[PDB]
Amino acid sequence: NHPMLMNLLK
Amino acid sequence: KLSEEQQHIIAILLDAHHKTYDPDFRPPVPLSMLPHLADLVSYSIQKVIGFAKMIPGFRDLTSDDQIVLLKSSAIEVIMLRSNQSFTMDDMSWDCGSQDYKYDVTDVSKAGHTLELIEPLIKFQVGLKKLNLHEEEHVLLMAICIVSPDRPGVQDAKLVEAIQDRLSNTLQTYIRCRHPPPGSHQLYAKMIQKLADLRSLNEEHSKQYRSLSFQPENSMKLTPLVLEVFGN
Ligand SMILES: C[C@H](CCC(=O)NCCC(=O)O)[C@H]1CC[C@H]2[C@@H]3CC[C@@H]4C[C@H](CC(C)(C)O)CC[C@]4(C)[C@H]3CC[C@]12C
């Protein structure tokens, strides 16, 4: 439910 | 007295901050400033995430815990990091040139009221009066993010252990390096500032929920802003 946050974390 | 580990943490946090804070957006123009400042906040969220990843121990957290800490701290860290570009000379965020200089008039034209703006400005003044070392400023940003009392945290004990390491580094730094009487109850005043940010966070959320209920305003936001602050 948080794909853009997840991407910025990785 | 400051351990090798404690100096290491401070060195890492200063570098993370220098790499991610710089004193592209829709241009600045009651909502005339919403597009520009939505873009500024959206961009600043990415900077917060850049800083968070370089916090010692952050990487040891599960993706979920990293996500809940960043979702719940982002606006507070944006307000807190802005303090270095804030000028008591004329109560503005003076990011070099006049185009990107933001006073009470400017930041009140993005569909948020003085119910948020007035405490935000008083917070910036109160923080300037503390006259923090950059060492204390970057520790406060890290302690703000890695907080075990945020809703949705899975491993509260792990987040608590990381925060305590950061807290202990900060208290040690104040005792060894902050000149008395400027050091007196400085840790407690800094924690009070974290409390003022929780209250600013709550007021921002209330106002964001109303603003973002209005689809003509939601339309002016960014995808990252919608994912972090919600629909
Ligand atoms: C210009 C300042 C940064 C200056 C800096 O930090 N520059 C450095 C960057 C970098 O280089 O990384 C920022 C710091 C806090 C900011 C305010 C936070 C509250 C509020 C949020 C709202 C977002 C929505 C989504 C609309 O709810 C938009 C208006 C709103 C009033 C902001 C205005 C601009 C503010 C004052």
Side-chain angles (χ1 to χ4, degrees):
Chain A
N1 189 57
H2 295 103
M4 291 171 272
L5 272 194
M6 198 57 264
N7 180 75
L8 283 176
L9 277 176
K10 296 153 55 79
Chain B
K1 276 150 179 161
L2 276 167
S3 66
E4 271 292 291
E5 184 174 323
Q6 289 175 331
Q7 299 169 84
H8 156 82
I9 292 161
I10 292 168
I12 287 174
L13 288 180
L14 287 172
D15 185 76
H17 176 56
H18 299 149
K19 278 190 163 71
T20 54
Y21 193 77
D22 176 31
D24 295 323
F25 303 160
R26 290 171 285 177
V29 175
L31 299 162
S32 60
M33 282 295 285
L34 175 51
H36 179 77
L37 293 173
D39 285 349
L40 187 162
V41 170
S42 198
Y43 168 93
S44 296
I45 292 162
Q46 301 178 42
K47 303 289 233 206
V48 168
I49 292 171
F51 174 83
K53 296 209 301 212
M54 308 189 259
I55 301 175
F58 194 75
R59 61 162 185 214
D60 298 337
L61 299 178
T62 66
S63 293
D64 306 327
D65 273 344
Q66 297 186 191
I67 283 157
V68 315
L69 297 179
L70 283 174
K71 278 195 74 160
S72 89
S73 66
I75 201 62
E76 300 175 16
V77 178
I78 292 157
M79 290 169 181
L80 176 47
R81 78 204 296 276
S82 72
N83 189 253
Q84 292 202 131
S85 80
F86 187 78
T87 78
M88 293 222 286
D89 273 338
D90 63 9
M91 300 312 176
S92 78
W93 293 270
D94 196 339
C95 300
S97 71
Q98 148 96 336
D99 306 297
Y100 313 115
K101 183 169 185 288
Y102 308 100
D103 67 13
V104 199
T105 313
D106 297 322
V107 298
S108 62
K109 295 176 161 179
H112 289 286
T113 72
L114 241 61
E115 194 124 15
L116 179 61
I117 305 322
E118 188 271 354
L120 175 59
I121 293 163
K122 297 291 88 138
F123 166 85
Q124 299 294 336
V125 174
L127 187 52
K128 276 301 194 195
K129 292 186 146 193
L130 290 189
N131 222 321
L132 288 197
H133 303 184
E134 189 174 43
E135 291 82 344
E136 293 152 353
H137 181 70
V138 298
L139 278 162
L140 186 61
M141 291 191 294
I143 298 164
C144 180
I145 295 159
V146 186
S147 209
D149 56 350
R150 303 285 201 187
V153 170
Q154 309 187 124
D155 202 350
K157 292 331 99 189
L158 184 46
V159 174
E160 191 178 24
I162 297 160
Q163 199 187 48
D164 290 346
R165 283 197 302 115
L166 296 167
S167 277
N168 242 290
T169 303
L170 175 52
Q171 288 179 354
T172 301
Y173 180 87
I174 291 170
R175 304 191 61 267
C176 290
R177 293 286 184 78
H178 202 105
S183 55
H184 175 68
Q185 286 290 351
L186 182 51
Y187 183 72
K189 293 166 190 180
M190 292 178 73
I191 298 309
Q192 182 50 239
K193 283 294 163 288
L194 292 190
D196 307 340
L197 288 160
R198 299 295 180 88
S199 171
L200 288 166
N201 188 345
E202 287 168 345
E203 182 59 27
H204 179 262
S205 318
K206 267 188 180 66
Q207 288 193 26
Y208 173 91
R209 284 203 311 290
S210 309
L211 176 134
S212 77
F213 216 71
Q214 321 285 73
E216 75 269 25
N217 299 328
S218 279
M219 228 171 52
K220 315 313 295 191
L221 303 186
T222 72
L224 189 58
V225 165
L226 290 166
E227 177 183 295
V228 172
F229 295 124
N231 297 325

mmCIF file of all heavy atoms in Angstrom, chain B residues 20-23 34 37-38 40-41 43-44 47 75 78-79 81-83 85 93 95 102 107-108 110 112 116-117 120 124 204 208 211 221 225 229, ligand 1:
data_model
loop_
_atom_site.group_PDB
_atom_site.id
_atom_site.type_symbol
_atom_site.label_atom_id
_atom_site.label_comp_id
_atom_site.label_asym_id
_atom_site.label_seq_id
_atom_site.Cartn_x
_atom_site.Cartn_y
_atom_site.Cartn_z
ATOM 1 N N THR B 20 21.880 15.894 2.250
ATOM 2 C CA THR B 20 20.416 15.914 1.988
ATOM 3 C C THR B 20 19.772 17.268 2.290
ATOM 4 O O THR B 20 18.591 17.386 2.012
ATOM 5 C CB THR B 20 19.653 14.880 2.828
ATOM 6 O OG1 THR B 20 19.963 15.046 4.216
ATOM 7 C CG2 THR B 20 19.962 13.464 2.392
ATOM 8 N N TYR B 21 20.481 18.240 2.865
ATOM 9 C CA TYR B 21 19.952 19.617 3.064
ATOM 10 C C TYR B 21 20.714 20.609 2.180
ATOM 11 O O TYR B 21 21.922 20.811 2.419
ATOM 12 C CB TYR B 21 20.058 20.065 4.525
ATOM 13 C CG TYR B 21 19.275 21.315 4.854
ATOM 14 C CD1 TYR B 21 17.898 21.263 5.015
ATOM 15 C CD2 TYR B 21 19.895 22.546 5.016
ATOM 16 C CE1 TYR B 21 17.159 22.393 5.331
ATOM 17 C CE2 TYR B 21 19.167 23.690 5.320
ATOM 18 C CZ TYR B 21 17.795 23.613 5.475
ATOM 19 O OH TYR B 21 17.058 24.718 5.780
ATOM 20 N N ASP B 22 20.001 21.252 1.249
ATOM 21 C CA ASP B 22 20.536 22.335 0.378
ATOM 22 C C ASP B 22 19.851 23.672 0.699
ATOM 23 O O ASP B 22 18.712 23.895 0.296
ATOM 24 C CB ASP B 22 20.377 21.972 -1.101
ATOM 25 C CG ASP B 22 20.833 23.091 -2.027
ATOM 26 O OD1 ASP B 22 21.775 23.844 -1.637
ATOM 27 O OD2 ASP B 22 20.223 23.227 -3.117
ATOM 28 N N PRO B 23 20.504 24.614 1.428
ATOM 29 C CA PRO B 23 20.020 25.996 1.510
ATOM 30 C C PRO B 23 20.149 26.740 0.166
ATOM 31 O O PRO B 23 19.563 27.808 0.068
ATOM 32 C CB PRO B 23 20.902 26.663 2.587
ATOM 33 C CG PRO B 23 21.627 25.524 3.278
ATOM 34 C CD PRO B 23 21.693 24.397 2.263
ATOM 35 N N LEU B 34 -0.369 26.776 -3.246
ATOM 36 C CA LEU B 34 -0.529 25.324 -2.969
ATOM 37 C C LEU B 34 0.318 24.494 -3.943
ATOM 38 O O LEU B 34 0.994 23.575 -3.514
ATOM 39 C CB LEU B 34 -2.001 24.915 -2.995
ATOM 40 C CG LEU B 34 -2.250 23.417 -2.834
ATOM 41 C CD1 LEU B 34 -1.504 22.876 -1.615
ATOM 42 C CD2 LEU B 34 -3.740 23.109 -2.739
ATOM 43 N N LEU B 37 4.123 24.688 -3.005
ATOM 44 C CA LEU B 37 4.528 24.246 -1.656
ATOM 45 C C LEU B 37 4.198 22.768 -1.503
ATOM 46 O O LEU B 37 4.922 22.114 -0.762
ATOM 47 C CB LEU B 37 3.857 25.100 -0.582
ATOM 48 C CG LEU B 37 4.293 26.559 -0.544
ATOM 49 C CD1 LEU B 37 3.430 27.317 0.448
ATOM 50 C CD2 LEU B 37 5.777 26.710 -0.218
ATOM 51 N N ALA B 38 3.189 22.245 -2.209
ATOM 52 C CA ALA B 38 2.994 20.784 -2.322
ATOM 53 C C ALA B 38 4.255 20.133 -2.924
ATOM 54 O O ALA B 38 4.693 19.105 -2.407
ATOM 55 C CB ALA B 38 1.760 20.485 -3.128
ATOM 56 N N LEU B 40 7.370 21.443 -3.009
ATOM 57 C CA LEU B 40 8.465 21.677 -2.034
ATOM 58 C C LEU B 40 8.395 20.600 -0.943
ATOM 59 O O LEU B 40 9.419 19.934 -0.656
ATOM 60 C CB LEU B 40 8.322 23.099 -1.489
ATOM 61 C CG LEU B 40 9.468 23.596 -0.594
ATOM 62 C CD1 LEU B 40 9.447 25.110 -0.488
ATOM 63 C CD2 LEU B 40 9.405 22.977 0.784
ATOM 64 N N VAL B 41 7.213 20.374 -0.379
ATOM 65 C CA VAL B 41 7.053 19.348 0.675
ATOM 66 C C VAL B 41 7.315 17.969 0.073
ATOM 67 O O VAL B 41 7.953 17.149 0.748
ATOM 68 C CB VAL B 41 5.678 19.421 1.343
ATOM 69 C CG1 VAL B 41 5.455 18.221 2.245
ATOM 70 C CG2 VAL B 41 5.502 20.704 2.117
ATOM 71 N N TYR B 43 9.167 16.980 -2.498
ATOM 72 C CA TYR B 43 10.643 16.935 -2.661
ATOM 73 C C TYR B 43 11.321 16.727 -1.302
ATOM 74 O O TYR B 43 12.240 15.943 -1.218
ATOM 75 C CB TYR B 43 11.088 18.248 -3.299
ATOM 76 C CG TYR B 43 12.564 18.533 -3.298
ATOM 77 C CD1 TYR B 43 13.357 18.173 -4.371
ATOM 78 C CD2 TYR B 43 13.152 19.230 -2.253
ATOM 79 C CE1 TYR B 43 14.706 18.466 -4.399
ATOM 80 C CE2 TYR B 43 14.501 19.542 -2.270
ATOM 81 C CZ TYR B 43 15.277 19.162 -3.349
ATOM 82 O OH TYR B 43 16.610 19.453 -3.358
ATOM 83 N N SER B 44 10.901 17.473 -0.270
ATOM 84 C CA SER B 44 11.558 17.491 1.063
ATOM 85 C C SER B 44 11.346 16.125 1.731
ATOM 86 O O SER B 44 12.215 15.710 2.530
ATOM 87 C CB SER B 44 11.016 18.602 1.922
ATOM 88 O OG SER B 44 11.313 19.887 1.382
ATOM 89 N N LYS B 47 14.141 13.957 0.724
ATOM 90 C CA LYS B 47 15.346 14.341 1.492
ATOM 91 C C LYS B 47 15.262 13.705 2.877
ATOM 92 O O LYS B 47 16.290 13.241 3.398
ATOM 93 C CB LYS B 47 15.432 15.860 1.635
ATOM 94 C CG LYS B 47 15.433 16.640 0.329
ATOM 95 C CD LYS B 47 16.709 16.499 -0.471
ATOM 96 C CE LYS B 47 17.313 17.839 -0.848
ATOM 97 N NZ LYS B 47 18.136 17.727 -2.074
ATOM 98 N N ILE B 75 6.472 15.197 8.092
ATOM 99 C CA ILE B 75 6.160 16.649 8.180
ATOM 100 C C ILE B 75 6.950 17.274 9.341
ATOM 101 O O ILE B 75 7.435 18.410 9.181
ATOM 102 C CB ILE B 75 4.644 16.907 8.265
ATOM 103 C CG1 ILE B 75 4.314 18.336 7.827
ATOM 104 C CG2 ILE B 75 4.116 16.596 9.657
ATOM 105 C CD1 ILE B 75 4.679 18.627 6.382
ATOM 106 N N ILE B 78 10.466 17.864 8.294
ATOM 107 C CA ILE B 78 10.516 18.974 7.298
ATOM 108 C C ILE B 78 10.500 20.321 8.027
ATOM 109 O O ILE B 78 11.396 21.182 7.735
ATOM 110 C CB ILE B 78 9.428 18.825 6.224
ATOM 111 C CG1 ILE B 78 9.762 17.611 5.360
ATOM 112 C CG2 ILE B 78 9.293 20.103 5.398
ATOM 113 C CD1 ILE B 78 8.594 17.019 4.659
ATOM 114 N N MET B 79 9.602 20.477 9.001
ATOM 115 C CA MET B 79 9.520 21.694 9.859
ATOM 116 C C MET B 79 10.832 21.883 10.629
ATOM 117 O O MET B 79 11.395 23.001 10.608
ATOM 118 C CB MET B 79 8.354 21.567 10.836
ATOM 119 C CG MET B 79 6.997 21.646 10.144
ATOM 120 S SD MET B 79 5.677 21.185 11.264
ATOM 121 C CE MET B 79 4.222 21.320 10.228
ATOM 122 N N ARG B 81 14.006 20.572 10.032
ATOM 123 C CA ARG B 81 15.187 20.816 9.164
ATOM 124 C C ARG B 81 15.134 22.237 8.572
ATOM 125 O O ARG B 81 16.207 22.839 8.355
ATOM 126 C CB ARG B 81 15.277 19.731 8.095
ATOM 127 C CG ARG B 81 14.310 19.907 6.946
ATOM 128 C CD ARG B 81 14.075 18.550 6.310
ATOM 129 N NE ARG B 81 15.316 18.052 5.747
ATOM 130 C CZ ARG B 81 15.776 18.362 4.549
ATOM 131 N NH1 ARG B 81 15.083 19.174 3.764
ATOM 132 N NH2 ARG B 81 16.918 17.833 4.131
ATOM 133 N N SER B 82 13.946 22.799 8.378
ATOM 134 C CA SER B 82 13.763 24.150 7.794
ATOM 135 C C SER B 82 14.384 25.224 8.710
ATOM 136 O O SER B 82 14.695 26.336 8.202
ATOM 137 C CB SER B 82 12.306 24.408 7.510
ATOM 138 O OG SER B 82 11.561 24.604 8.715
ATOM 139 N N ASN B 83 14.601 24.907 9.993
ATOM 140 C CA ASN B 83 15.054 25.883 11.016
ATOM 141 C C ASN B 83 16.399 26.514 10.607
ATOM 142 O O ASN B 83 16.593 27.733 10.864
ATOM 143 C CB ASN B 83 15.135 25.266 12.414
ATOM 144 C CG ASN B 83 15.378 26.329 13.461
ATOM 145 O OD1 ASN B 83 16.470 26.424 14.001
ATOM 146 N ND2 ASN B 83 14.392 27.195 13.687
ATOM 147 N N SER B 85 17.400 27.353 7.653
ATOM 148 C CA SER B 85 17.189 28.391 6.606
ATOM 149 C C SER B 85 16.215 29.477 7.107
ATOM 150 O O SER B 85 15.953 30.442 6.370
ATOM 151 C CB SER B 85 16.761 27.748 5.294
ATOM 152 O OG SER B 85 15.385 27.442 5.312
ATOM 153 N N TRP B 93 11.722 31.941 5.765
ATOM 154 C CA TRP B 93 12.627 30.892 5.247
ATOM 155 C C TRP B 93 13.300 31.468 4.007
ATOM 156 O O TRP B 93 12.620 31.701 3.001
ATOM 157 C CB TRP B 93 11.865 29.604 4.987
ATOM 158 C CG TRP B 93 11.350 28.941 6.226
ATOM 159 C CD1 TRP B 93 12.009 28.009 6.979
ATOM 160 C CD2 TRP B 93 10.051 29.098 6.821
ATOM 161 N NE1 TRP B 93 11.214 27.579 8.003
ATOM 162 C CE2 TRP B 93 10.009 28.225 7.934
ATOM 163 C CE3 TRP B 93 8.924 29.879 6.532
ATOM 164 C CZ2 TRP B 93 8.896 28.128 8.763
ATOM 165 C CZ3 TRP B 93 7.815 29.771 7.346
ATOM 166 C CH2 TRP B 93 7.799 28.901 8.439
ATOM 167 N N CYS B 95 15.780 30.897 1.467
ATOM 168 C CA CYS B 95 16.471 29.869 0.639
ATOM 169 C C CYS B 95 17.140 30.599 -0.534
ATOM 170 O O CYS B 95 16.540 30.631 -1.649
ATOM 171 C CB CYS B 95 15.496 28.779 0.185
ATOM 172 S SG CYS B 95 14.697 27.873 1.545
ATOM 173 N N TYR B 102 10.213 32.645 1.808
ATOM 174 C CA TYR B 102 8.840 32.279 2.240
ATOM 175 C C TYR B 102 8.565 32.941 3.592
ATOM 176 O O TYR B 102 9.251 32.588 4.569
ATOM 177 C CB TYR B 102 8.682 30.757 2.295
ATOM 178 C CG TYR B 102 9.092 30.045 1.032
ATOM 179 C CD1 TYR B 102 10.333 29.432 0.927
ATOM 180 C CD2 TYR B 102 8.253 29.986 -0.064
ATOM 181 C CE1 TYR B 102 10.739 28.794 -0.236
ATOM 182 C CE2 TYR B 102 8.643 29.363 -1.236
ATOM 183 C CZ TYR B 102 9.886 28.761 -1.324
ATOM 184 O OH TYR B 102 10.268 28.144 -2.475
ATOM 185 N N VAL B 107 3.329 31.288 2.991
ATOM 186 C CA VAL B 107 3.043 29.906 3.482
ATOM 187 C C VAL B 107 1.575 29.804 3.933
ATOM 188 O O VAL B 107 1.045 28.674 4.070
ATOM 189 C CB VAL B 107 4.049 29.473 4.564
ATOM 190 C CG1 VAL B 107 5.476 29.439 4.023
ATOM 191 C CG2 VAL B 107 3.963 30.319 5.822
ATOM 192 N N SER B 108 0.881 30.932 4.074
ATOM 193 C CA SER B 108 -0.565 30.944 4.407
ATOM 194 C C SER B 108 -1.438 30.920 3.135
ATOM 195 O O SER B 108 -2.658 31.058 3.264
ATOM 196 C CB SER B 108 -0.867 32.117 5.315
ATOM 197 O OG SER B 108 -0.571 33.340 4.673
ATOM 198 N N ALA B 110 -1.671 28.256 0.876
ATOM 199 C CA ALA B 110 -1.635 26.841 0.461
ATOM 200 C C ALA B 110 -2.772 26.077 1.143
ATOM 201 O O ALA B 110 -2.667 24.839 1.241
ATOM 202 C CB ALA B 110 -0.275 26.260 0.759
ATOM 203 N N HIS B 112 -3.764 26.106 4.230
ATOM 204 C CA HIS B 112 -3.577 25.884 5.683
ATOM 205 C C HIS B 112 -3.735 27.239 6.355
ATOM 206 O O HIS B 112 -3.402 28.246 5.709
ATOM 207 C CB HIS B 112 -2.222 25.244 5.998
ATOM 208 C CG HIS B 112 -2.129 23.826 5.570
ATOM 209 N ND1 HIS B 112 -2.775 22.816 6.244
ATOM 210 C CD2 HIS B 112 -1.494 23.251 4.528
ATOM 211 C CE1 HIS B 112 -2.543 21.677 5.627
ATOM 212 N NE2 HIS B 112 -1.747 21.915 4.586
ATOM 213 N N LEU B 116 -2.227 26.462 12.020
ATOM 214 C CA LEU B 116 -0.947 25.719 11.797
ATOM 215 C C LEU B 116 0.224 26.711 11.710
ATOM 216 O O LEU B 116 1.245 26.465 12.349
ATOM 217 C CB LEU B 116 -1.076 24.875 10.519
ATOM 218 C CG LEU B 116 0.172 24.068 10.125
ATOM 219 C CD1 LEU B 116 0.556 23.064 11.205
ATOM 220 C CD2 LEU B 116 -0.039 23.375 8.781
ATOM 221 N N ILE B 117 0.084 27.800 10.956
ATOM 222 C CA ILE B 117 1.236 28.668 10.571
ATOM 223 C C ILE B 117 1.782 29.355 11.824
ATOM 224 O O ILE B 117 2.993 29.377 11.983
ATOM 225 C CB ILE B 117 0.875 29.696 9.477
ATOM 226 C CG1 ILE B 117 0.270 29.074 8.209
ATOM 227 C CG2 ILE B 117 2.074 30.567 9.155
ATOM 228 C CD1 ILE B 117 0.873 27.772 7.815
ATOM 229 N N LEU B 120 3.773 27.189 13.991
ATOM 230 C CA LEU B 120 4.953 26.741 13.204
ATOM 231 C C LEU B 120 6.043 27.806 13.330
ATOM 232 O O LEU B 120 7.219 27.457 13.586
ATOM 233 C CB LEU B 120 4.585 26.534 11.736
ATOM 234 C CG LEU B 120 5.786 26.195 10.858
ATOM 235 C CD1 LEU B 120 6.463 24.925 11.352
ATOM 236 C CD2 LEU B 120 5.368 26.073 9.404
ATOM 237 N N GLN B 124 9.757 27.810 15.272
ATOM 238 C CA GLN B 124 11.038 28.152 14.605
ATOM 239 C C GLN B 124 11.816 29.160 15.457
ATOM 240 O O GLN B 124 13.033 29.038 15.556
ATOM 241 C CB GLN B 124 10.790 28.749 13.225
ATOM 242 C CG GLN B 124 10.072 27.812 12.256
ATOM 243 C CD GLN B 124 10.863 26.591 11.872
ATOM 244 O OE1 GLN B 124 12.083 26.585 11.933
ATOM 245 N NE2 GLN B 124 10.154 25.532 11.505
ATOM 246 N N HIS B 204 -1.496 19.858 11.248
ATOM 247 C CA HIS B 204 -1.264 19.604 9.801
ATOM 248 C C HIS B 204 -2.197 18.479 9.315
ATOM 249 O O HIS B 204 -2.887 18.700 8.313
ATOM 250 C CB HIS B 204 0.204 19.274 9.486
ATOM 251 C CG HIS B 204 0.365 19.016 8.029
ATOM 252 N ND1 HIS B 204 0.383 17.729 7.510
ATOM 253 C CD2 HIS B 204 0.372 19.850 6.971
ATOM 254 C CE1 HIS B 204 0.426 17.791 6.197
ATOM 255 N NE2 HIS B 204 0.439 19.073 5.842
ATOM 256 N N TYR B 208 -4.938 18.881 6.582
ATOM 257 C CA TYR B 208 -4.680 18.146 5.322
ATOM 258 C C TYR B 208 -5.930 17.317 4.978
ATOM 259 O O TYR B 208 -6.288 17.223 3.790
ATOM 260 C CB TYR B 208 -3.414 17.281 5.413
ATOM 261 C CG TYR B 208 -3.232 16.397 4.206
ATOM 262 C CD1 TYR B 208 -2.508 16.845 3.113
ATOM 263 C CD2 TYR B 208 -3.838 15.152 4.121
ATOM 264 C CE1 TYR B 208 -2.366 16.076 1.965
ATOM 265 C CE2 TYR B 208 -3.698 14.361 2.980
ATOM 266 C CZ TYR B 208 -2.948 14.822 1.903
ATOM 267 O OH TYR B 208 -2.794 14.093 0.762
ATOM 268 N N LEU B 211 -8.573 19.813 3.506
ATOM 269 C CA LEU B 211 -8.062 20.331 2.213
ATOM 270 C C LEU B 211 -8.191 19.217 1.171
ATOM 271 O O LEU B 211 -8.786 19.467 0.114
ATOM 272 C CB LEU B 211 -6.615 20.805 2.380
ATOM 273 C CG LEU B 211 -5.941 21.275 1.092
ATOM 274 C CD1 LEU B 211 -5.197 22.581 1.309
ATOM 275 C CD2 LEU B 211 -5.007 20.200 0.552
ATOM 276 N N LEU B 221 -1.997 18.438 -5.473
ATOM 277 C CA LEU B 221 -0.984 17.730 -4.648
ATOM 278 C C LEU B 221 -0.107 16.876 -5.573
ATOM 279 O O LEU B 221 -0.207 17.028 -6.805
ATOM 280 C CB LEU B 221 -1.690 16.895 -3.575
ATOM 281 C CG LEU B 221 -2.613 17.692 -2.654
ATOM 282 C CD1 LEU B 221 -3.159 16.834 -1.519
ATOM 283 C CD2 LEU B 221 -1.892 18.917 -2.122
ATOM 284 N N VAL B 225 2.885 12.848 -1.923
ATOM 285 C CA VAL B 225 2.125 13.542 -0.848
ATOM 286 C C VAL B 225 0.844 12.754 -0.543
ATOM 287 O O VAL B 225 0.582 12.496 0.639
ATOM 288 C CB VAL B 225 1.853 15.014 -1.184
ATOM 289 C CG1 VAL B 225 0.781 15.595 -0.278
ATOM 290 C CG2 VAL B 225 3.122 15.835 -1.085
ATOM 291 N N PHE B 229 0.591 11.267 3.190
ATOM 292 C CA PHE B 229 -0.390 11.987 4.048
ATOM 293 C C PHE B 229 -1.798 11.424 3.864
ATOM 294 O O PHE B 229 -2.589 11.568 4.800
ATOM 295 C CB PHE B 229 -0.327 13.490 3.813
ATOM 296 C CG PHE B 229 0.993 14.091 4.220
ATOM 297 C CD1 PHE B 229 1.753 14.817 3.321
ATOM 298 C CD2 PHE B 229 1.474 13.938 5.514
ATOM 299 C CE1 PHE B 229 2.978 15.352 3.687
ATOM 300 C CE2 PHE B 229 2.696 14.482 5.879
ATOM 301 C CZ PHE B 229 3.456 15.175 4.958
HETATM 302 C C1 LIG C 1 9.746 26.456 3.143
HETATM 303 C C2 LIG C 1 10.118 25.597 4.364
HETATM 304 C C3 LIG C 1 11.329 24.692 4.006
HETATM 305 C C4 LIG C 1 12.696 25.405 3.756
HETATM 306 C C5 LIG C 1 13.779 24.247 3.598
HETATM 307 O O1 LIG C 1 13.813 23.333 4.444
HETATM 308 N N1 LIG C 1 14.595 24.212 2.532
HETATM 309 C C6 LIG C 1 15.609 23.151 2.327
HETATM 310 C C7 LIG C 1 15.126 22.011 1.398
HETATM 311 C C8 LIG C 1 16.271 21.052 0.967
HETATM 312 O O2 LIG C 1 17.280 21.475 0.365
HETATM 313 O O3 LIG C 1 16.245 19.808 1.209
HETATM 314 C C9 LIG C 1 8.946 24.637 4.690
HETATM 315 C C10 LIG C 1 9.227 24.026 6.087
HETATM 316 C C11 LIG C 1 7.859 23.668 6.689
HETATM 317 C C12 LIG C 1 6.888 23.929 5.561
HETATM 318 C C13 LIG C 1 5.413 24.041 5.906
HETATM 319 C C14 LIG C 1 4.954 22.787 6.640
HETATM 320 C C15 LIG C 1 3.449 22.911 6.898
HETATM 321 C C16 LIG C 1 2.648 23.103 5.626
HETATM 322 C C17 LIG C 1 2.626 21.823 4.763
HETATM 323 C C18 LIG C 1 1.794 21.988 3.504
HETATM 324 C C19 LIG C 1 1.864 20.702 2.656
HETATM 325 C C20 LIG C 1 0.428 20.145 2.246
HETATM 326 C C21 LIG C 1 0.597 18.814 1.472
HETATM 327 C C22 LIG C 1 -0.259 21.202 1.326
HETATM 328 O O4 LIG C 1 -0.379 19.824 3.388
HETATM 329 C C23 LIG C 1 2.303 23.158 2.704
HETATM 330 C C24 LIG C 1 2.272 24.483 3.490
HETATM 331 C C25 LIG C 1 3.070 24.351 4.806
HETATM 332 C C26 LIG C 1 2.631 25.584 5.622
HETATM 333 C C27 LIG C 1 4.627 24.290 4.581
HETATM 334 C C28 LIG C 1 5.134 25.585 3.914
HETATM 335 C C29 LIG C 1 6.630 25.537 3.616
HETATM 336 C C30 LIG C 1 7.472 25.162 4.828
HETATM 337 C C31 LIG C 1 7.401 26.360 5.776
#
